[PDB]
């Protein structure tokens, strides 16, 4: 089984523009949205059909009420941050929590907060402590770290509850999450002359492409495209290296994807 992760994201905005919501929260299983809530709908709803089809209205009803409580908790917490920063205008506050089931069976877990898109507090569930980036964060840490019970709760949740949910969702969504769609990899030349290694049509989006020269990993000489959504459930990417006019070389594209390795030599 490949690596899988579950994540929940919260975003709050102190002075949102007309329409723009002040609170949003989205869940992901790997790269798929599975849940959404926001301060305008005020309803939690699946963004995945295999979610909607496997959880009864009682679940959405229950989590709708919780998110209405969390929205308010966020409103309050962001009010507090902005006043201890002495900041005017609109500012943002964010949370992320979740876990990974790695391929070998071991697990990871993580929880952190952001202010204005930079790290604010990061949890370490092994020392049972918070890391603070500035003195506004330091004051939240002394407060949060005094409820030894509440940190014990986070460690239990990240390690047992998160992993349990993720196992449950992997089964609901397995036809999506556990399929393999191998990539279609070609090569071509572009004006200096460049070798572009293009792949497309593949799922999951975890793929490694690299150019090798004469059996050595040309690196710092490689130029990596990003992995991009195609719009239909699959992804494309590329990597380019720059050809030498003065000496021939044996260039070859290497692609790894879901336990399969691919090599295209350039004649």
């Amino acid at each position: 089984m490949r690596t899988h992760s579950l994540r929940y994201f919260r975003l709050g905005v102190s002075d949102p523009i007309h329409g723009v919501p002040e609170f949003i929260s989205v869940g992901y299983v790997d790269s798929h949205p599975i849940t959404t809530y926001d301060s305008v709908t005020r309803q939690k709803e699946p963004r995945a059909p295999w979610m909607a089809e496997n959880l009864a209205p009682d679940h959405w009803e229950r989590y709708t009420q919780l998110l209405r409580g969390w929205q308010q908790m966020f409103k309050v917490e962001l009010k507090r941050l902005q006043r201890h920063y002495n900041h005017s205008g609109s500012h943002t506050y964010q949370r992320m929590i979740g876990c990974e089931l790695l391929e070998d069976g071991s697990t990871t877990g993580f929880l952190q907060y952001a202010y204005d898109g930079q790290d604010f507090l990061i949890f370490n569930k092994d020392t049972l402590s918070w890391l603070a980036v500035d003195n506004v964060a330091h004051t939240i840490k002394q407060a949060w770290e005094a409820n030894q019970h509440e940190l014990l709760y986070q460690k239990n949740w990240l390690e047992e509850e998160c992993i349990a949910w993720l196992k449950r969702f992997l089964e609901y969504g397995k036809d999506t999450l556990q399929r393999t769609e191998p990539p279609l990899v070609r090569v071509n030349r572009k004006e200096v002359t460049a070798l572009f290694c293009k792949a497309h049509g593949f799922y999951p989006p975890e793929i490694y492409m690299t150019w090798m020269k004469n059996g050595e990993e040309i690196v710092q000489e490689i130029d990596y495209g990003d992995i991009l959504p195609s719009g239909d459930g699959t992804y494309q990417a590329w990597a380019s290296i720059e050809l030498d006019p003065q000496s021939s070389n044996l260039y070859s594209c290497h692609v790894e994807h879901s336990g399969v390795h691919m090599v295209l030599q350039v004649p």
């Epitope: 229950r62 919780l66 409580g69 308010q72 908790m73 509440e150 709760y153 239990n156 949740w157």
Partner: antibody, heavy 109, light 116 residues
């Protein structure tokens, strides 16, 4: 089917040790609470366990084994003022409390 | 520091009659609950209020309804009292709901007997 099961009633003697069990079969687990309820009065919070092990709070200790679905509340050096019901409660996967029926503790002077 | 103040402490009702149970908390809590205690059973949630602005049912809502009037108060309403509603009722509150370790703070209880 979630259930919490605690013994109906217990009798110990003044100055002795008593140990109140609570076993749970839940849908997930976010913590197990102990509350104290004097007759005619309101329940008050005693303790909380979410990891494994034992925590000491004065004359009362409370234990938790997540693997076994099991917690006890241990009352040392019993006193008549310890006569009450003891209520155990478990937060499930959806953060909603499930309440045991309660254990009446009777103290022989 | 009053804690959780609920009233009345005692009440006798006839079948079919109406009654509202008052509950207030001065602790600036966000979540409030209405529980029903009966012999030989664990507590049972009737309605709850996760924050000011929202309520939802619990395990045993039929025959009851509620109003989160403001941040302080949370009222439970019987509207056609029935014998099976004879019970002791406890209002409760916590700082938040959906936190993990937060304890509940209880009122003194309200005891209702419903008679034909």
């Amino acid at each position: 089917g979630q259930n919490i099961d605690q013994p109906t009633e217990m009798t110990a003697t003044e100055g002795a040790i008593v140990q109140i069990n609570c076993t749970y079969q839940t849908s997930g687990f976010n913590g197990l609470f102990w509350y104290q309820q004097h007759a005619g009065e309101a329940p008050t919070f005693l303790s909380y366990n979410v990891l494994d092990g034992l925590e000491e709070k004065g004359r009362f200790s409370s234990f938790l084994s997540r693997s076994k679905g099991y917690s006890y509340l241990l009352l040392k050096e019993l006193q008549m003022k310890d006569s009450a019901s003891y209520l155990c409660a478990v937060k499930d996967s959806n953060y909603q409390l499930i309440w045991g029926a309660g254990t009446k503790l009777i103290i022989k002077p | 520091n009053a804690g959780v103040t609920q009233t009345p402490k005692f009440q006798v009702l006839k079948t079919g009659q109406s009654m509202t149970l008052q509950c207030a908390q001065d602790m600036n809590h966000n979540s409030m609950y209405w529980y029903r205690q009966d012999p030989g059973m664990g507590l049972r949630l009737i309605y709850y209020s996760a924050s000011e602005g929202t309520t939802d049912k619990g395990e045993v809502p039929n025959g009851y309804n509620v109003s989160r009037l403001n941040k302080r108060e949370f009222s439970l309403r019987l509207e056609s009292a029935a014998p099976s509603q004879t019970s002791v009722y406890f209002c409760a509150s916590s700082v938040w709901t959906g936190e993990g370790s937060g304890e509940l703070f209880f009122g003194e209880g309200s005891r209702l007997t419903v008679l034909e």
